[PDB]
């Protein structure tokens, strides 16, 4: 029998006056309790109980022992209570960062399903991209981050699981002079709104121009805000690069076109990043599952 059950039973025995009554009250087997008490007495090398006409009383030894037994039972209960309070607070909240692509399609659908499964959980969704999320992830504030990244850039102490392989698209105002272009070379005369990338503003288009043997793309402006980007492009002759999800889901869709080139652009891999050592709550694990699920 578990020692704690045996101590709890002993406290009950003192209270109700009988080993048989204690076992029944606590839903323990009588023979198992009687054996467990005997085993404990053999270990202590003294009897804890003496028979009387109508039950058992504690012996002098059991009296002394009981003072400790009560402290041990209370302490076990308090420990369970403190841990429950601390685990409840840990398990009851999620803080993570999400990139625009996740934020715009999967995240909305994932949160509703997540909430049905984990009704008692608060979510704190931050705007975030690597490597800005790297240090927030590193101290413990962020439970995980969801972002495009180049696998070989990710800090060695971070775990990384592929979430979805994304699309990027070149976007301009709906009547842009270069809308019919099929080659990146045909865009050399255009000016660019450099957008946010893990490798810095304009990293994608600059890398594209480079691998195609073109000069540096002409900087029109730097727009780190994906929120602002579609509107800014819609009201200019600037071209930009954005996640396909943002092109599909923005307030200026009717004022914009994509320029589908026969030249290839990257398909950024979006990763779930966590600190490797950290243990993961049920809810955080469930949310990731739900986000995975809706990232078809």
Which of 221, 254, 215 minimizes the C-alpha distance to 239? 221
Q: How far apart are CA 181 and CA 206, in angstroms?
A: 18
Stretch that binds ligand TSU, among 12-20, 68-76, 131-139, 175-183 (CB under 6 A): 12-20
Angle between helices 3-16 and 30-44 in degrees, nearest 10 = 100
Q: Residue 104: how many CB atoms within 10 A of its CB? A: 18
Quote the DSSP letter at residue 98. Answer: E
**Is residue 99 a known part of a binding site?**
yes
If one asks whether residue 201 binds ligand TSU (CB under 6 A), the answer comes out as no
The token pair that represents 265 in the structure block: 């652009």
If one asks whether residue 268 binds ligand TSU (CB under 6 A), the answer comes out as yes
If one asks whether residue 18 binds ligand TSU (CB under 6 A), the answer comes out as yes
Question: Length of the chain in residues, anyone?
Answer: 296
- Applying the rule CB under 5 A, the residues between 276 and 295 that interact with Cl ion are 285-286, 289
x-or-dash string of contact with a second copy, 1-30, rule CB under 8 A: xxxxx-------------------------
- Say which entry of a second copy, ligand TSU, Cl ion, none residue 289 contacts (CB below 5 to 8 A, set by partner kind): Cl ion
| Torsion sign over Cα 85, 89, 90, 92 | positive
E-state strands within the chain = 49-52, 55-58, 93-98, 122-127, 144-148, 158-165, 168-173, 191-195, 218-223, 240-243, 256-258, 269-275
If one asks whether residue 103 binds a second copy (CB under 8 A), the answer comes out as yes
Least distance in Å: CB of 261 to ligand TSU?
A: 15
**108, 162, 177, 200: which one binds a second copy (CB under 8 A):** 108
The token pair that represents 228 in the structure block: 């602002």
Stretch that binds ligand TSU, among 39-47, 62-70, 78-86, 95-103 (CB under 6 A): 95-103
Kindly report whether the peptide bond that precedes residue 131 is cis, defined as omega within 30 degrees of 0: yes
The binding site comprises 99, 101
Which residues in this chain contact ligand TSU in the complex, by CB under 6 A? 18-20, 51-56, 99-102, 105-106, 111-117, 123, 147-148, 150-153, 164, 166-168, 191, 196-198, 204, 220-221, 236-238, 243-245, 266, 268-270, 295
The binding site for toluene-4-sulfonate comprises 99, 101
């Amino acid at each position: 029998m578990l020692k704690l059950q045996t101590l709890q039973a002993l406290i009950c025995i003192e209270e109700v006056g009988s080993l048989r009554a204690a076992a029944q009250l606590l839903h323990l087997s009588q023979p198992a309790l009687s054996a467990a008490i005997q085993q404990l007495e053999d270990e202590l090398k003294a009897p804890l109980l003496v028979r009387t006409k109508r039950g058992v009383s504690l012996t002098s030894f059991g009296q002394a022992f009981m003072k400790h037994a009560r402290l041990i039972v209370t302490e076990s209960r308090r420990a369970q209570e403190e841990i429950g309070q601390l685990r409840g607070r840990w398990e009851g909240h999620i803080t993570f960062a999400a990139s625009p692509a996740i934020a715009l399609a999967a995240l909305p659908l994932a949160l509703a399903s997540f909430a049905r499964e984990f009704p008692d959980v608060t979510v704190n969704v931050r705007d975030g991209m690597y490597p800005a999320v790297s240090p927030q992830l590193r101290d413990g504030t962020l439970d995980f981050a969801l972002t495009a990244a180049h696998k070989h850039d990710i800090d060695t102490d971070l775990e990384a699981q592929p979430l979805y392989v994304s699309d990027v698209v070149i976007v301009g105002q709906r009547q842009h002079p270069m809308a019919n272009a099929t080659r990146l070379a045909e865009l050399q005369e255009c000016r660019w709104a450099f957008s946010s990338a893990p490798r810095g503003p304009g990293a994608i288009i600059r890398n594209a121009f480079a691998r195609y043997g073109l000069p540096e793309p002409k900087l029109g402006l730097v727009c780190e805000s994906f929120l602002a980007l579609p509107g800014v492009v819609a009201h200019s002759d600037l071209l930009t690069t954005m996640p396909r999800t943002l092109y599909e889901r923005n307030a200026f869709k009717d004022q914009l076109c994509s320029i589908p080139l026969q030249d290839a652009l990257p398909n950024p891999t979006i990763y779930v990043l966590r600190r490797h050592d950290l243990p993961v709550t049920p809810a955080a694990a469930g949310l990731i599952r739900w986000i995975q699920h809706h990232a078809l």
